[PDB]
Amino acid sequence: SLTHRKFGGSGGSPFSGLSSIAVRSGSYLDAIIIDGVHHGGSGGNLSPTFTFGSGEYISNMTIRSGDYIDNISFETNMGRRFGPYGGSGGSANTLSNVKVIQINGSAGDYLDSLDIYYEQY
Amino acid sequence: SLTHRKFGGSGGSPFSGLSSIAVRSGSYLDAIIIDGVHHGGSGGNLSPTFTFGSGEYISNMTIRSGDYIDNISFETNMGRRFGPYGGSGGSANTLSNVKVIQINGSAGDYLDSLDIYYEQY
Ligand SMILES: OC[C@H]1O[C@H](O)[C@@H](O)[C@@H](O)[C@@H]1O
Ligand SMILES: OC[C@H]1O[C@H](O)[C@@H](O)[C@@H](O)[C@@H]1O
């Protein structure tokens, strides 16, 4: 069962465990790079790094996918855009009015899958 | 609404967006360092870095807290441990039989709070 729990007091300023995303891409996403840590192969070309500012989160994302992740694009609450990166195969799915919390997945020579954890508004 | 959606196919090796954790600790947790990104103050002492392997996740976690986070320890599904680090103040809460997805929180000079996102089995 997916949940969250807060521990501790009311002070300080909020932070997120997710800080940056880049991809390698060609016809597919060869790799996703999350907070600098590479997952996937060495093919394609490396994208610039998107670093989240304070309080900035993915609010909308379009992923093309089939057996792999073909393409990713996203927009943040601050109206900044990443991508599209990758190719034109697969089929498209969109998340809208969300707050992405975490990205897990699976990868070999390419990025096979993404598990997006998010809050749906 | 906290939610998960998977995109793509069945192949490759699993990875988590949450890759590494270290802390600065003394009496309290002065800071948590998530995938190399520092959150909190410069006091206490820097712990070694714990880095997750493919398919590895925090399965049990004990947090002592009060006004701040006093202490953290955890165990993984591969029987590895981190901590305990910090002091004996505050009171303990344990998450048992979980899969940690994300660690967010709030920090100033110390780690005021943690907001742990997880699957509860
Ligand atoms: O993205 C998969 C594949 O696409 C193209 O064939 C090239 O850009 C490769 O280098 C890359 O590995
Ligand atoms: O995801 C890679 C590839 O997987 C399958 O072969 C199909 O869904 C394609 O359209 C897609 O491009």
Ligand SMILES: OC[C@H]1O[C@H](O)[C@@H](O)[C@@H](O)[C@@H]1O
């Ligand atoms: O990443 C694409 C492909 O790469 C490798 O061949 C393996 O890791 C497969 O399981 C995976 O599907």
Ligand SMILES: OC[C@H]1O[C@H](O)[C@@H](O)[C@@H](O)[C@@H]1O
């Ligand atoms: O239920 C998900 C989400 O839906 C809307 O955005 C609002 O009603 C929020 O209160 C709520 O949390």
Ligand SMILES: OC[C@H]1O[C@H](O)[C@@H](O)[C@@H](O)[C@@H]1O
């Ligand atoms: O952890 C809070 C605080 O605890 C002790 O007083 C010392 O270890 C300090 O350096 C540290 O900042």
Ligand SMILES: OC[C@H]1O[C@H](O)[C@@H](O)[C@@H](O)[C@@H]1O
């Ligand atoms: O959390 C830091 C500190 O906050 C309060 O002072 C109490 O709950 C203490 O027991 C605890 O050590």
Ligand SMILES: OC[C@H]1O[C@H](O)[C@@H](O)[C@@H](O)[C@@H]1O
């Ligand atoms: O982190 C402990 C403390 O540090 C600073 O004084 C501020 O950021 C406070 O809000 C916070 O509670």
